């Protein structure tokens, strides 16, 4: 089989309320091969079919998909927001293209600053984001944002923003692209 440069882990989140946020996170599977990635993707529910209040997260092995993880606490995220009416037309395409960015190490020189990606399915609107390790590394953050924006094919006129997890936790953009 053909190996990937990193081992990745898929996590699932289900909003409960009678549970603490951390207790609602569940590790689903791990893979480090091209064949194993496709085996997972071809046999698990699509993001567009998840119930409102759930999330899928793909993070490098060893990094939990939460602000508290050492590799995320000083970091932040590039955020993509979508309307509820775009669930069946763009959500799945955006998520898969995002996954291929991660697994295919599309950020080259700054690959070590990437922690993972998260897709949130909500009644008000869906969100997809790429999490990075340091919200102060301007060159790294800016590079990832530009590469990501181009890959998704977003019209060069609709700017996306980068938010530090610290700011998100204390409810806005450190950078825009
Ligand atoms: C990513 N994340 C989210 N939460 C909790 O989940 C809540 C919901 O944040 P959300 O990321 O699930 O998006 P949502 O659109 O539902 O919410 P909104 O942006 O607040 O309108 C946060 O306010 C926190 O209470 C988190 N709580 C902890 N402890 N750690 C995390 O990494 C973490």
């Amino acid at each position: 089989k053909h190996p990937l440069q990193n081992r990745w882990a898929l996590w699932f989140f289900k909003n409960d309320k009678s549970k603490t946020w951390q207790a609602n996170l569940r590790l689903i599977s791990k893979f480090d091969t091209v064949e194993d990635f496709w085996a997972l993707y071809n046999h698990i529910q699509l993001s567009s079919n998840l119930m409102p209040g759930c999330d899928y997260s793909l993070f490098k092995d060893g990094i939990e998909p939460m602000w508290e993880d050492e590799k995320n606490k000083r970091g932040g995220r590039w955020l993509i927001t979508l309307n509820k009416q775009q669930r069946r037309s763009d959500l799945d395409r955006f998520w898969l293209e995002t996954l291929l960015c991660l697994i295919g190490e599309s950020f080259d020189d700054y690959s070590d600053d990437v922690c993972g990606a998260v897709v949130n399915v909500r009644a008000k609107g869906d969100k997809i984001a790429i999490w990075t390790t340091e919200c102060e590394n301007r060159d790294a953050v800016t590079h990832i944002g530009r590469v990501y924006k181009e890959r998704l094919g977003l019209p060069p006129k609709i700017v996306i923003g980068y938010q530090s997890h610290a700011d998100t936790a204390t409810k806005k953009n450190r950078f825009v692209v």
Side-chain angles (χ1 to χ4, degrees), residues 1-16 18-123 125-171 173-177:
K1 298 185 181 182
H2 303 61
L4 296 178
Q5 288 184 58
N6 281 106
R7 179 175 292 122
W8 301 84
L10 176 68
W11 301 72
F12 176 69
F13 177 88
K14 170 71 172 181
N15 188 58
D16 180 299
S18 78
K19 295 286 192 300
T20 186
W21 187 88
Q22 282 189 47
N24 289 310
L25 195 64
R26 183 64 156 138
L27 170 68
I28 300 307
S29 184
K30 297 185 176 187
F31 61 87
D32 45 52
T33 276
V34 174
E35 290 79 3
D36 291 315
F37 164 74
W38 288 112
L40 174 63
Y41 186 78
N42 284 155
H43 299 102
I44 196 171
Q45 287 194 180
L46 292 166
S47 292
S48 58
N49 287 313
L50 293 177
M51 293 182 79
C54 299
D55 321 314
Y56 268 147
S57 300
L58 188 75
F59 278 64
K60 289 180 181 173
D61 189 47
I63 304 177
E64 293 168 57
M66 50 184 265
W67 303 325
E68 299 94 310
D69 191 279
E70 279 305 307
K71 298 196 69 179
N72 295 322
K73 57 193 309 169
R74 294 171 264 62
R77 85 231 270 226
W78 272 109
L79 224 204
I80 305 300
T81 303
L82 303 307
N83 300 306
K84 175 81 179 62
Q85 292 61 52
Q86 316 172 316
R87 213 198 222 62
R88 305 187 344 186
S89 64
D90 305 308
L91 189 63
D92 295 318
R93 183 179 70 263
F94 282 177
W95 183 232
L96 179 56
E97 288 182 0
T98 294
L99 302 176
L100 295 174
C101 273
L102 289 176
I103 285 57
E105 309 295 312
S106 296
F107 304 109
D108 309 340
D109 318 284
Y110 302 101
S111 298
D112 279 305
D113 278 66
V114 180
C115 300
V118 180
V119 59
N120 303 123
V121 179
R122 303 286 185 277
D126 316 309
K127 292 175 290 185
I128 293 182
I130 287 298
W131 285 33
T132 74
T133 200
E134 290 290 322
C135 68
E136 263 51 55
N137 298 41
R138 193 193 185 76
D139 294 328
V141 173
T142 304
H143 183 78
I144 292 168
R146 291 183 174 301
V147 173
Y148 187 44
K149 180 184 172 60
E150 173 180 45
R151 178 65 128 258
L152 295 187
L154 302 181
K157 300 189 177 186
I158 56 172
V159 300
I160 57 175
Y162 181 86
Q163 321 172 305
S164 76
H165 294 315
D167 299 335
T168 303
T170 65
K171 303 180 178 184
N173 295 308
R174 296 304 191 72
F175 308 101
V176 297
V177 164

